[PDB]
Design a protein around this nucleic acid. Structure first.
Lengths: 176, 129, 67, 81, 106, 104
RNA sequence: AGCUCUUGCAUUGCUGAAUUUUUUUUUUUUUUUUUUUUUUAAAAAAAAAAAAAAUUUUUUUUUUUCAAGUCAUCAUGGGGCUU
RNA sequence: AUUGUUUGAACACCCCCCAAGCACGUGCCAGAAGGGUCGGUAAAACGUGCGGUGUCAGUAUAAAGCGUCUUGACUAGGCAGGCAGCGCGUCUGAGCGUG
């Protein structure tokens, strides 16, 4: 089989910096009419550029290298952009729930460090979150749902630069 | 442009893609391992040659309690305020371990006669060595 | 020990909440807009949020069923 | 120019073209559609409140569509004057 | 708030081993030195120990190491680790003390 | 060349507001201005502390408490006076001001 | 070095069984229109239309499982043998 | 102010969680384990040597308290659907009460 790569993505791999993280690789099972038990390796690859554009890719195949390569290229096909404060923290408090998992995410002032669970440490270093305290609640037994949940939870927040043109009201003085 | 990279961009010097045009499949991606943290603590102690837990732990809480701007230019400032790193900055030894032996002789003359605190430092600004 | 010592700090601040909420009505005394007894708040060991009953009474007397 | 890929798909039948609006949303193409009251039109970008029920609406819509697309405005300026 | 919840909140601070009675180590006299056969899929004859303990109550104890030297009327020190392979037994005989000392060439 | 560069203790994104013609009035946003001003203030203060620490560069006690050496008089710094053995009141010796300033 | 000595529950190879039926629905040629790559040109790509059709005396050929069988087909792991 | 040169010693671990792997030994026996469990004749867990990882004059076991545990939920669970709506109503408790 052959995985796809476009033309205009080939200004980006020559463009931004990039890092790659496999989320988890999982072996599923199916007993099938005719020959027996067919398995697929499902692989989940995250890819960011450490400046606030994040990507996820889920891939399914028969063997582990081909599965991780498919999810590797699927993530690099699928990128979404996430606003940060100066590349280290998120704008608001963030709460979200994918499948039924209660993530709770807070901003922290820069130089707090990442106080953060296992895979989400590489995830926040991937997209570029240097200073965030998180906790995940509910059944945390799946890596895939915390990855997808984290992508949507990043996409939830609100940006202040879409106001100053049209609110008549200037937005500055960040002194605590 | 080439130099002065991000101070936590050490994932570009571990594994890279789109700069190796060969081997399109079978590219090694990093798993979820904490062993790079443990070996990074090994990189921390090997810069002192010291016993692993107590010194880097005590310097870790002192680095929290000293000032609160950040933990990157200031935690290595807690590393740099230590006397064996300070001697390595002077250049009285081939490496940190030989400097630690030289201070184990008490050949050193911090602040007049000797440091009052030999294993821990900490050299505040204004202290002669 | 500051739990014990910081009880009555907001107690003397509640009295002008009474007086600037209700001119002519008088440890503090709180007349919730309901049955005729004014309802009393006063000291303990565990320190109290003074101005919950005064603040609530000003709320419910000015804007009934605020909550 | 080159690279013939769509820019704006207009839909004149939601009932038999619901997938067309959905696929245009998946291609990030804005859409113009007529509301029929059965299909999920939650992906229409520019809804038009017609209902695919009129040859008269089709004549009116297509007639203005053709009379604006066929003739450039400076020609109308020379035609009126 | 809801006043049923207001009265809804000192319980039994429950020792998860109820035979050491909150202590870590209790000595005792071995009542019987015996072995048994375990739950499947284990089938090796494990050696155990019923001990009349310090607290006047009795419970079974795992005997570790390459053999042992315990007979009737023999004092041991009992620790708090259990052996899983038979149900209901929670005790481990620590070695490095009394008539039950260490094995030869460990 | 030389200067102090300090990034401010770097904060949350903010509750953040000002009226509109202040955009045309004010020049630089307060994070850069606070960086420059806090750099100047901390530079002057740590220069004073550095010059003091650079220019720094009996204990037998065993006390049966005898009243041998003279006596100095939240505690109100600077110290008030020096009381001698002879009942005399005197201001502070220079060395005593030095080691009072070392004590803090 | 030689075994016809063992082990087919160590094996390669090859086969048995019925799993007896499925092996035609798919492309190619031509036409029209158009666009992708290269300093005077081929392929490529895309929309539609039409025809050619799919091997052999008609069975072979494509097929899933049994530690199925065979160390005497040769081979070969292990073991045995060499008055 | 005076001069010479140098890193111990143990304990536990080394299938996954959890950093670290092989040889002979014995093959559901001696055994280990906190859990999943491994040994049913080719043991990456058990007998021993080698080799390596953690902590270091300490180290592991045992316990005990808190957290993880939103695992008594006020912050912060819920309750047809795992466990959780009393068989229903009258009902001046307490609590909430401007059409």
């Amino acid at each position: 089989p052959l995985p796809p790569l476009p033309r205009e993505l080939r200004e980006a791999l020559y463009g931004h910096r990039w890092d790659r993280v496999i989320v988890d690789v999982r072996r599923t099972h199916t007993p099938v009419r005719g020959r027996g038990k067919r398995e697929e390796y499902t692989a989940m690859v995250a890819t960011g550029n450490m400046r606030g554009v994040f990507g996820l890719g889920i891939g399914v195949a028969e063997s582990a290298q081909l599965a991780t390569a498919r999810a590797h290229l699927d993530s690099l096909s699928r990128l979404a952009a996430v606003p940060l404060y100066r590349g280290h923290t998120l704008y608001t408090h963030v709460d979200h729930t994918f499948h039924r998992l209660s993530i709770r995410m807070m901003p922290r002032p820069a130089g707090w460090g990442l106080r953060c669970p296992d895979l989400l440490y590489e995830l926040c270093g991937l997209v570029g979150l240097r200073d965030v305290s998180i906790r995940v609640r509910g059944q945390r037994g799946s890596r895939f749902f915390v990855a997808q949940c984290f992508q949507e939870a990043l996409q939830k927040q609100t940006t202040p630069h879409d106001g100053v043109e049209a609110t008549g009201m200037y937005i500055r003085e960040v002194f605590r | 442009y080439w130099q002065a990279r991000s101070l936590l961009h050490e994932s570009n010097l571990h594994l890279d893609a789109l700069g190796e045009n060969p081997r399109y499949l079978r590219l090694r991606r990093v798993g979820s391992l904490f062993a790079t943290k443990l070996q990074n603590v090994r990189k921390l102690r090997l810069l002192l040659g010291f016993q692993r837990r107590g010194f880097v732990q005590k310097l870790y809480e002192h680095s929290l309690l000293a000032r609160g701007s950040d933990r990157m230019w200031k935690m290595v400032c807690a590393m740099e305020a230590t006397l064996p790193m300070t001697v390595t900055r002077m250049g009285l030894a081939e490496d940190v371990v030989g400097a630690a032996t030289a201070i184990r002789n008490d050949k050193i003359y911090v602040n007049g006669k000797q440091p009052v605190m030999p294993r821990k430092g900490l050299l505040e600004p204004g202290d002669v060595v | 020990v500051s739990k014990l010592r910081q009880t009555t700090a907001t107690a003397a601040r509640a009295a002008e909440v009474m007086r600037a909420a209700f001119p002519g009505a008088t440890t503090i005394a709180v007349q919730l807009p309901r049955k005729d007894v004014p309802t009393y708040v006063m000291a303990n060991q565990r320190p109290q949020p003074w101005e919950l009953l005064p603040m609530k009474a000003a709320a419910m007397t000015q804007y009934p069923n605020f909550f | 120019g080159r690279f013939r890929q769509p820019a704006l798909v207009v839909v004149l039948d939601l009932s038999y073209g619901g997938e067309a609006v959905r696929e245009a949303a998946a291609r990030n193409v804005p859409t113009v559609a007529l509301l029929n009251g059965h299909s999920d039109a939650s992906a229409v970008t520019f809804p038009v409140y017609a209902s695919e029920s009129h040859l008269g609406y089709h004549h009116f819509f297509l007639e203005w569509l053709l009379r604006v697309v066929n003739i450039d405005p400076k020609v109308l300026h020379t035609l009126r004057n | 708030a809801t006043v049923g919840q207001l009265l809804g909140g000192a319980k039994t601070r429950k020792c998860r081993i109820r035979q050491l009675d909150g202590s870590p180590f209790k000595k005792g006299i071995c009542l019987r030195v015996y072995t048994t056969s375990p739950k499947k899929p284990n089938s090796a004859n494990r050696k155990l120990a019923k001990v009349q303990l310090s607290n006047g109550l009795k419970a079974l104890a795992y005997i570790p190491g390459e053999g042992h030297n315990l007979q009737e009327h023999s004092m041991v020190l009992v620790s708090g680790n259990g052996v899983r392979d038979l149900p209901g037994v929670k005790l481990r005989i620590v070695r490095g003390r009394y008539d039950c000392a260490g094995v030869k060439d460990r | 060349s030389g200067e102090r560069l300090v990034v401010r203790l770097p904060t949350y994104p903010a509750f953040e507001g000002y009226p509109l013609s202040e955009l045309d009035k004010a020049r630089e946003g307060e994070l850069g201005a606070l960086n420059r001003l806090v750099a100047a203030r901390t530079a002057a203060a740590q220069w004073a502390a550095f010059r003091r620490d650079l220019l720094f560069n009996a204990w037998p006690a065993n006390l049966r408490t005898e009243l041998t050496r003279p006596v100095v008089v939240a505690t109100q710094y600077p110290p008030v006076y020096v009381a001698a053995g002879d009942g005399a009141k005197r201001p502070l010796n220079e060395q005593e001001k030095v080691y009072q300033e070392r004590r803090l």
